[PDB]
């Protein structure tokens, strides 16, 4: 019954690969716990080079924090197996990450699905905050989706392996400028993270070498406005992207504000053939 498990290689087993990234390759597959009857769905994520034990100390204090994270909308590390290379393990979100859900069903989303994805992440990440931890990589490539209508902030920033250069089209001018990361950066973040899913996955500052974008944001320039935004929605965007972090909404106020928006969700994001989960009125 402890909260984070140390597994023993017996007790789960490798399904399906889903995806590598620059700190390992994720596995769909299936856990007995030790002790248990049940299967469990997991992914299992092996890290990419073999570790010491000096270096599994520091693996392991920051597995039990990940272990502690308990909210609908943040994925809970649930055990560790401390193999040559090591592996990690989590509840399956079987419908894999947001950003090519929407990508990949882009015909098949109303703006009630893209409202309450926003709501989700922004109680999420309000979550992080109050257990004073900051994501650091909020991306919708770091958001899973584990029913169409329940979405999961996973896999922290530890500095789509071509979008680190540090994701620095997704960081805060100050993050890019002096590596300060806060909950108000996590903000910015998340400002480009709701732009991803209004246009469907799109490339933010698509034709922007990384090298440049500290300079263009410092003209004053930012993301465009997605054509099924509204403007009401696009203005919550630019607010993410202040250049003074104080000033930029909190999260608690994005729940408020996306939540309101998702009581009548063809009024703020207009899609063909959606015709004008939180209840709409
Ligand atoms: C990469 C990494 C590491 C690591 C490491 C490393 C160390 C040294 C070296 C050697 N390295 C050599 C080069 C240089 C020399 O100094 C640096 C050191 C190499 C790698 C450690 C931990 C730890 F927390 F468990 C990690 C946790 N995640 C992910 C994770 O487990 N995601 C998964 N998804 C599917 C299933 S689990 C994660 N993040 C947040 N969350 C999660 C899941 C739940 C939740 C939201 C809450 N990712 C981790």
Same mark, same amino acid.
């Given at each position: 019954?402890?909260?984070?498990?140390? +597994?023993?290689?017996?007790?789960?087993?490798?399904?399906?690969?889903?995806?590598?990234?620059?700190?390992?390759?994720?596995?769909?597959?299936?856990?007995? /716990?030790?002790?248990?009857?049940?299967?469990?769905?997991?992914?299992?994520?092996?890290? #990419?080079?073999?570790?010491?034990?000096?270096?599994?100390?520091?693996?392991?204090?920051?597995?039990?924090?990940?272990?502690?994270?308990?909210?609908?909308?943040?994925? #809970?590390?649930?055990?560790?197996?401390?193999?040559?290379?090591?592996?990690?393990?989590? @509840?399956?979100?079987?419908?894999?990450?947001?950003?090519?859900?929407? $990508?990949?069903?882009?015909?098949?989303?109303?703006?009630?699905?893209?409202?309450?994805?926003?709501?989700?992440?922004?109680?999420?990440?309000?979550?992080?905050?109050?257990? #004073?931890?900051?994501?650091?990589? +909020?991306?919708?490539?770091?958001?899973?989706?584990?029913?169409?209508?329940?979405?999961?902030?996973?896999?922290?920033?530890?500095?789509?392996? &071509?979008?680190?250069?540090?994701?620095?089209?997704?960081?805060?001018? %100050?993050?890019? +400028?002096?590596?300060?990361?806060?909950?108000?950066?996590?903000?910015?973040?998340?400002?480009?993270?709701?732009?991803?899913?209004?246009?469907?996955?799109? &490339?933010?500052?698509?034709?922007?070498?990384?090298?440049?974008?500290?300079?263009?944001?410092?003209?004053?320039?930012?993301?465009?406005? /997605?054509?099924?935004?509204?403007?009401?929605?696009?203005?919550?965007? $630019?607010?993410?992207?202040?250049?003074?972090?104080?000033? $930029?909404?909190?999260?608690?106020?994005?729940?408020?504000?996306?939540? &309101?928006?998702?009581?009548?969700?063809?009024?703020?994001?207009?899609? @063909?053939?959606? %015709? #004008?989960?939180?209840?709409?009125?």
């Amino acid at each position: 019954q402890a909260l984070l498990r140390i +597994l023993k290689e017996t007790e789960f087993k490798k399904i399906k690969v889903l995806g590598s990234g620059a700190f390992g390759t994720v596995y769909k597959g299936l856990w007995i /716990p030790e002790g248990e009857k049940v299967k469990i769905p997991v992914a299992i994520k092996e890290l #990419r080079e073999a570790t010491s034990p000096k270096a599994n100390k520091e693996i392991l204090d920051e597995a039990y924090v990940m272990a502690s994270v308990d909210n609908p909308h943040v994925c #809970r590390l649930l055990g560790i197996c401390l193999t040559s290379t090591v592996q990690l393990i989590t @509840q399956l979100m079987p419908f894999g990450c947001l950003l090519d859900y929407v $990508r990949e069903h882009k015909d098949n989303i109303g703006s009630q699905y893209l409202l309450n994805w926003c709501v989700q992440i922004a109680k999420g990440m309000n979550y992080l905050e109050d257990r #004073r931890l900051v994501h650091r990589d +909020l991306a919708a490539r770091n958001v899973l989706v584990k029913t169409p209508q329940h979405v999961k902030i996973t896999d922290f920033g530890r500095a789509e392996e &071509k979008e680190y250069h540090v994701p620095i089209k997704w960081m805060a001018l %100050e993050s890019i +400028l002096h590596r300060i990361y806060t909950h108000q950066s996590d903000v910015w973040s998340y400002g480009v993270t709701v732009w991803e899913l209004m246009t469907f996955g799109s &490339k933010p500052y698509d034709g922007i070498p990384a090298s440049e974008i500290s300079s263009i944001l410092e003209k004053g320039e930012r993301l465009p406005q /997605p054509p099924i935004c509204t403007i009401d929605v696009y203005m919550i965007m $630019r607010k993410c992207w202040m250049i003074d972090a104080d000033s $930029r909404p909190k999260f608690r106020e994005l729940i408020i504000e996306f939540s &309101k928006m998702a009581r009548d969700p063809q009024r703020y994001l207009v899609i @063909q053939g959606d %015709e #004008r989960l939180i209840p709409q009125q």
